[PDB]
A paper describes a structure:
After the recognition, [name] is released from the ribosomes as the guanosine disphosphate (GDP)-bound form and regenerated by its specific guanine nucleotide exchange factor, [name], a heterodecameric complex of two copies each of the α-, β-, γ-, δ-, and ε-subunits. Various stressors such as viral infection lead to the suppression of cap-dependent translation and the activation of the integrated stress response (ISR), since the stress-induced phosphorylated eukaryotic translation initiation factor 2 [[name](αP)] tightly binds to [name] to prevent it from exchanging guanine nucleotide molecules on its substrate, unphosphorylated [name]. [name] ([name]) evades this cap-dependent translation suppression through the interaction between its nonstructural protein [name] and host [name]. Here, our cryo-electron microscopy (cryo-EM) analysis reveals that [name] [name] binds to the α-subunit of [name] in a competitive manner with [name](αP).
We also analyzed the mixture of human [name], unphosphorylated [name], and [name] [name], and obtained the cryo-EM structures of the [name]•[name] [name]•unphosphorylated [name] ternary complex. Most of the ternary complex particles contained only one molecule of [name], but small fractions of those containing two [name] molecules were also observed. There are no notable structural differences in [name] or [name] [name] between these two ternary complexes. These structures revealed that [name] [name] and the unphosphorylated [name] can bind to [name] simultaneously and there is no direct interaction between them. The [name] [name] binding does not seem to affect the unphosphorylated [name]α binding, because [name] [name]-bound [name] is able to accommodate [name] without major conformational changes. The only exception is the quite small closure of the interface for unphosphorylated [name], as observed in the comparison of the [name]•unphosphorylated [name] complex structure with the [name] apo structure. The conformation of [name] is essentially the same as that in the [name]•unphosphorylated [name] complex structures and the switch 1 region in the nucleotide-binding [name]γ subunit is widely open as well. Therefore, it seems to be trapped in the nucleotide-free state. The binding of [name] [name] sterically blocks the inhibitory interaction between [name] and [name](αP), whereas it is compatible with the catalytic interaction between [name] and unphosphorylated [name]. As a result, [name] suppresses the inhibitory effect of [name](αP) and continues to catalyze nucleotide exchange on residual unphosphorylated [name], even in the presence of high levels of [name](αP).
Residue numbers in the entry:
A (entry chain N): 3 to 277
B (entry chain G): 166 to 521
C (entry chain J): 40 to 241
D (entry chain C): 8 to 99, 106 to 115, 127 to 351
E (entry chain H): 166 to 520
Write the structure that this text describes.
């Protein structure tokens, strides 16, 4: 049903780790290590904050997840002690990114297991040992390696095929990765009123529109439609919105230059934006 | 595990949430004679609480601390475990069972919190015998400084207020008040004492037995007649079972009545209590947090007939036996502690300075 | 939904303020040490107007000078103000004809004089007007704003008293007239022949 | 930054024009976020420079709407945090003891502000977790107006206890009716009354639980209109009164140090415009805030526990600096 | 037989002993259109009580006495019978029906008692027409000398207590207070008046509309803001619907609240009432005997919604709108009657001297 995200069982010291608070005691706060198959953990009260704090409940908030560093580990007694004073905002950000990517990877693996109908928890543990943790061991970078490998598999299915799990299981995993690691959807729209009330009005307007549309490269066809008489909407349904905005800006600049050259009228009704 | 004590008799609707047991029903009837839950430091204290062998709050705290010293001495760590946390996790059932036998007081709550803090403060590297010895030493130091020295300092402070030829009114069996009066009489102060008692405990007679044994002139009367005797009373002195952060005084049932009538008769009111008894929790009435004792103690034999004999056979009839009540701060003029002579409004301030 | 716009006529085409108007525009008179233009601009800004056009003909120089120093003319204001000057203006009809000639408005603008003191949020009325337009496919062209008041109130001066007759089910105006000096009022039969369900005279 | 100025202008316009955000908790959170952005996205070298900038912004925001004190309280809290951080990073209270005995700051300030937001998040649950110890079975609890804190308090209390709640509508803004439905949606057996009848029913009320808008230094209160009458009736009947108030509602000001303490709105709500002629001579006042002296307050409940009014001066002294009461 | 009125809505547990009728439900649905069980005057008066067309205590008493005069004029004794007790026996069902339409007040109770005592005292040797004329004359004399002359004397007495430049606070609608203020202003005094109103009747706008028509300066505000304006108030004048034997003042809901807040602000409180409203019964609070109005009156349309529209649909929801409440004597300083200005504890003495 569920297991630790990483093959490693006890996280090392000085490693920022996600926790979920469960209860409050005198010694400190009880948490579950969500990504280590919910092992019990402690946060000492003397380490909650650098300031003088009298109540644990001032920042415990049972039921709310948190990012805590590990200050001491004792594998013999199953005792892990954590901390909140040491963690920096940047460390929290990178740990949260790690947690999100690990959650995505585990969602993919859990979907694969459910598709395979592997009712045995041992079968799911073996699935973790074989399918996803192989890339984790290969890349020598826990967390990020699995997500990078899954992205590459969504790009090139060679990585997914290289796994030695099964044939039908490989197909199920590929389908799950495609349904999960390929959520590409974007449509950048903009509005601009291009019209020249001069001698060759319609001709100049058509020429400027064609010149602007000529800047639309492959996999980014800028289609211009006449929503109104004087205003025109340009739509480019392409991924990479960061580059799409620059492309739309370049097209708008080209259209404005073409309109100004022929002594016409060009107005930017709205900047490019997603739909 | 330990069973649950059965509530005895119907309760008032306003007090439906509080438990109410009977002295006849002892929980030990459902527990092993060679106590298998844990060692029987539980059962001795629990029986002496349920049967009311010890009543005074200081007496209860001392008995609990002695029993818990025995607990610590007999306790041994399990392999592959940490004492600083296992000790508290094991001690929590002791507190649960003790609450089942009889609800705890503020003094015992403070003692439990202090000992839990001490256990938590114990490091994970020190040896077992050293930890046990230092825990026992800490308990001894706590007892000493929080009871004996506090009582001596409070007696020294109260010696100033007690003037010659005056009348001092007390209430119930309180060790601090009796010791204060005895020490004041020792130093040559000449005065009278008026004792006010209330049913059904009638523990006020206790202090009377002290006062005659100290040669102090005394007088004794029940609570309702207090309004008759107050005009000749010059000072009212009351012990307290607890102090709250709002300045109110949680004490025996009759304390608030005496304070109110004393204010109505223009008589100063003194409340003597130790700092360790101060409790951070607050309440505005005796309904939210109290303790209902056995109602069967209410039955009395007047003439040859007991009116409340078969009270259970009347469905509409209800009996309540309150043991605690709250006196509002505005009716209190003194709190006498080892820190000195303070107003009630300064109760939280002490809680701030003793916490660190 | 295009951004909302509002036209703000800054001249009353009537000489009701001689000799005060002879040396100061009516729109610039201080009500409570504050110009009426400031009041109406604040009201427009409050109700979410993002573009305001002010038309000034009489003594437009003083209005220009005073307005350019106002808060609304600051670059930080969310109410974009555009000032138009034309001595050819003689009535509100000329102002609207000029607006249509230059086609500043896109759809559903606000018409209001420059001496209007109000704190009305017309979001509900605007939504009702847009819904009526959408369902009826561009039949309704105007939506007045009226406030309930007793006829004895001082605000209801005899110069601006108005009596209206509307359908109570859809707030569809059927008749509208002034009541200056009239001891009786007239209503054509047509009002009843169409809306047989009911008619309310207000 | 341009966007910083844009957000500041939007915030001050929203505060000065009407309501927003709906709950004072959201307003405090937005103020703290704006102050954090001011501290981060601005240039400053000395602590004095940052304090002067914060003081100017706080003066502007307070002048936007004086009747709203939460923004000022957050600004003063930030100023106190800055003072403490500078003092303990450079060196190491105004008491008698003091009388008789004479580079990386920004990250610490940001961390302190984040801690402040974290403890702001759970304030309502911190208050509501201790409801069970203040309510007994078959109690009668009376409430005035509308208050989310008291609503959550009563909902948490009613989970394991049964009692009766009587709500008085706060005319003219009859927001108590929301209680009338909301508690009814939880099945608490509530009753609705007009706020002309408090004393008449007051003798049959065991306890009164109310919220508040502001807490002054001496322990007074700024509450909804008519709360002074309710407190007076409670004092007359000596019924204990509870003020469920979060920690961030302690203004270090004093009652009579200023005016405009009451907030006046259009008299349309009290007397409708349709009266006509009589409005031409009749003067109408509609204050929406009333002053409650600390004598009539029995207990304060906050995210840190219970307290007496007489102790308020300490808490106000533990969150602000005396040299910042002028702002 | 007269049918009983059915209670509307679920009543509060503490007020289970009081009735609660809706304005929509009227008994006339189950009565003959040509009135046979009761006199047409009785049914008309009950209709205009149950619909709230008569609200003032003095107005209610006057209307009741006029209707009773109509009935007496229309009455005819039966054979083998005499007027003395037959008249009372016939009148009892009319009073029961009137109570069914709306609970009786102190003024109506006293009027009924006085009329019963007068009818019972009618000699057997009296002739029917002569007895009817005598009863009509007695009712007219009682109305005159117990309302009009009493109000004139009360206004004359209260004129002295009012000085130039002071501020007087009133509450609700009451003819006696308005007459006192108008006559005091007419006599030459100059002062402001502060009017306090309350939901849902909002009857204060009545007296305000009078004061503006008299040229008196005035101010208006709802009851909760009274604590705001009491610092500038010098005297408080209230109208009382009933005076109890123990000195308690049985009046409109907001009376006791205003008296308490005024006493807290250290402002004297004045009460003007007529001797005929002095009841002999006593009550220590507003729970033992009160009046429950239509609960639907509490609904107010704020914004675009009525928050209490389907209040019945919430099972645990109850609405409560009292009409009367009791002010303890310690919060009152004056009782102003035709006898003069008396302490609030002297009510029983008057009760003794009027019999």
């Amino acid at each position: 049903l569920s297991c630790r995200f990483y093959q490693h069982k006890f996280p090392e010291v000085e490693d920022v780790v996600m926790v979920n608070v469960r209860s409050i005691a005198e010694m400190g706060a009880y948490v579950s290590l969500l990504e280590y198959n919910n092992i019990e953990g402690m946060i000492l009260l003397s380490e909650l904050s650098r300031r003088r704090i009298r109540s644990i409940n001032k920042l415990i908030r049972i039921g709310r997840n948190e990012c805590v560093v590990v200050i001491r580990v004792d594998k013999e007694k199953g005792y892990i002690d954590l901390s909140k004073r040491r963690v920096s905002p940047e460390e929290a950000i990178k740990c949260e990114d790690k947690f999100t990517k690990s959650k995505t990877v585990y969602s993919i693996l859990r979907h694969v297991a459910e598709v395979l109908e592997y009712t045995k928890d041992e079968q799911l543990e073996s699935l973790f040992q074989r399918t996803a943790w192989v890339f984790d061991d290969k890349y020598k970078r826990p967390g990020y390696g699995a997500y990078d490998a899954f992205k590459h598999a969504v790009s090139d299915p060679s990585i997914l095929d290289s796994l030695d799990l099964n044939e039908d299981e490989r197909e199920v995993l590929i389908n799950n990765i495609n349904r999960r690691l390929t959520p590409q959807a974007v449509k950048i729209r903009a509005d601009i009123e291009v019209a020249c009330y001069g001698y060759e009005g319609i001709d100049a307007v058509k020429e400027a529109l064609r010149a602007g549309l000529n800047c639309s490269t492959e996999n980014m066809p800028i289609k211009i439609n006449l929503i109104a008489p004087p205003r025109y909407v340009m739509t480019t349904t392409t991924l990479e919105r960061t580059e799409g905005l620059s492309v739309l800006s370049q097209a708008m600049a080209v259209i404005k230059e073409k309109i100004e050259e022929k002594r016409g009228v060009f107005n930017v009704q709205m900047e490019p934006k997603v739909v | 595990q330990v069973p649950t004590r059965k509530d005895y008799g119907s309760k008032v609707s306003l007090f439906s949430h509080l438990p109410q047991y009977s002295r006849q029903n002892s929980l030990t009837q459902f527990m092993s004679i060679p106590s298998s839950v844990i060692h029987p430091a539980m059962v001795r204290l629990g029986l002496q609480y349920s049967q009311g062998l010890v009543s005074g709050s200081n007496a209860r705290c001392i008995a609990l601390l002695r029993a818990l010293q025995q607990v610590i001495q007999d306790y041994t760590t399990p392999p592959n475990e940490e004492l600083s946390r296992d000790l508290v996790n094991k001690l929590k059932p002791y507190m649960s069972f003790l609450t089942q036998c009889r609800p705890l007081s503020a003094s015992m709550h403070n003692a439990i919190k202090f000992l839990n803090k001490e256990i938590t403060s114990v490091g994970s590297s020190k040896r077992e015998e050293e930890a046990k010895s230092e825990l026992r030493a800490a308990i001894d130091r706590y007892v000493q400084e929080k009871i004996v020295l506090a009582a001596q300092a409070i007696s020294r402070f109260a010696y100033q207020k007690i003037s010659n030829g005056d009348v001092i009114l007390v209430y119930g069996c309180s060790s601090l008040v009796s010791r204060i009066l005895q020490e004041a009489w020792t130093e040559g102060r000449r005065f009278r004492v008026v004792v006010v008692d209330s049913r059904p405990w009638l523990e006020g007679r206790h202090t009377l037995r002290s006062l005659v044994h100290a040669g102090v002139p005394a007088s004794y009367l029940l609570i309702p007649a207090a309004s008759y005797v107050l005009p000749e009373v010059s000072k009212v002195l009351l012990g307290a079972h607890a102090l709250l952060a709002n300045g109110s005084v949680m004490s025996r049932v009759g304390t608030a009545q005496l304070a109110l009538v004393a204010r109505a008769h223009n008589v100063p009111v003194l409340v003597c209590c130790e700092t360790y008894k101060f409790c951070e929790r607050v309440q505005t009435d005796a309904f939210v947090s109290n303790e209902l004792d056995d109602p069967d103690d209410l039955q009395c034999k007047r003439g040859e007939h007991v009116a409340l004999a078969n009270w259970q056979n009347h469905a509409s009839l209800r009996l309540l036996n309150l043991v605690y009540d709250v006196t509002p701060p505005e009716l209190v003029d003194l709190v006498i502690t080892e820190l000195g002579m303070i107003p009630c409004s300064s109760v939280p301030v002490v809680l701030r300075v003793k916490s660190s | 939904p295009p951004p909302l716009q509002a036209v703000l006529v800054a001249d009353s085409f009537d000489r009701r303020f001689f000799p005060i108007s002879k040396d100061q525009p009516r729109v610039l008179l201080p009500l409570a040490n504050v110009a009426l233009i400031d009041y109406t601009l604040e009201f427009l800004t409050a109700t979410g107007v993002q573009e305001t056009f002010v038309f000034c003909c009489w003594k437009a120089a003083q209005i220009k000078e005073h307005l350019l120093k106002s808060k609304w003319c600051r670059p930080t204001s969310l109410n974009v103000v555009r000032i138009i000057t034309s001595e050819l203006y003689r009535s509100l009809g000329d102002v609207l004809r000029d607006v249509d000639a230059k086609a500043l408005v896109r759809s559903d603008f606000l018409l209001v004089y420059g001496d209007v003191i109000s704190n009305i949020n017309i979001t509900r009325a605007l939504e009702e007007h847009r819904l009526r337009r959408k369902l009826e496919k561009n039949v309704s062209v105007m939506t007045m704003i009226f406030k309930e008041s007793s006829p004895s109130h001082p605000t209801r001066c005899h110069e601006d008293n108005v009596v209206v007759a509307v359908d109570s089910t859809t707030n569809r105006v059927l008749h509208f007239q002034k009541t200056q000096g009239l001891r009786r009022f007239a209503f054509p039969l047509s009002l009843f022949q169409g809306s047989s369900d009911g008619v309310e005279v207000r | 930054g341009s966007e910083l100025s844009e957000r500041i202008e939007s915030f001050v316009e929203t505060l000065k024009r009407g309501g927003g955000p709906r709950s004072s908790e959201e307003m405090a959170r937005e103020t703290l976020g704006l102050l954090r952005q001011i501290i981060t996205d601005h240039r400053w070298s000395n602590a004095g420079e940052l304090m002067e900038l914060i003081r100017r912004e706080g003066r502007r925001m307070t002048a936007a709407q004086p009747s709203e004190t939460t923004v000022g309280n957050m600004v003063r809290r930030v100023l106190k945090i800055i003072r403490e951080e500078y003092g303990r990073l450079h060196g190491r209270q105004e008491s008698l003891h003091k009388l008789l005995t004479s580079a990386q700051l920004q990250s610490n300030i940001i961390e302190a502000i984040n801690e402040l937001l974290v403890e702001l998040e759970g304030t309502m649950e911190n208050i509501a977790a201790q409801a069970l110890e203040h309510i007994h079975s078959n109690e009668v609890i009376m409430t005035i107006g509308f208050s989310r804190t008291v609503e959550a308090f009563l909902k948490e209390a009613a989970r394991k206890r049964k009692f009766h709640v009587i709500v008085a509508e706060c005319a003219p803004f009859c927001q108590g009716h929301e209680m009338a439905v909301n508690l009814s949606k939880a099945g608490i057996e509530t009753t609705v009354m007009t706020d002309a009848a408090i004393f008449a029913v007051m003798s049959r009320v065991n306890k009164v639980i109310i919220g508040t808008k502001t807490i002054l230094a001496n322990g007074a209160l700024r509450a909804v209109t008519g709360t002074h009458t309710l407190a007076l009736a409670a004092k007359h009947h000596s019924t204990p009164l509870i003020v469920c108030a979060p920690m961030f509602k302690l203004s270090p000001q004093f009652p009579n140090e200023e005016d405009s303490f009451h907030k006046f709105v259009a008299p349309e709500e009290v007397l409708p415009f349709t009266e006509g002629d009589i409005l031409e001579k009749v003067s109408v006042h509609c204050p929406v805030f009333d002053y409650v002296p600390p004598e009539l307050i029995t207990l304060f409940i906050s995210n840190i526990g219970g307290n007496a009014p007489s102790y308020i001066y300490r808490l106000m002294s533990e969150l602000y600096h005396p040299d910042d009461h002028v702002l």
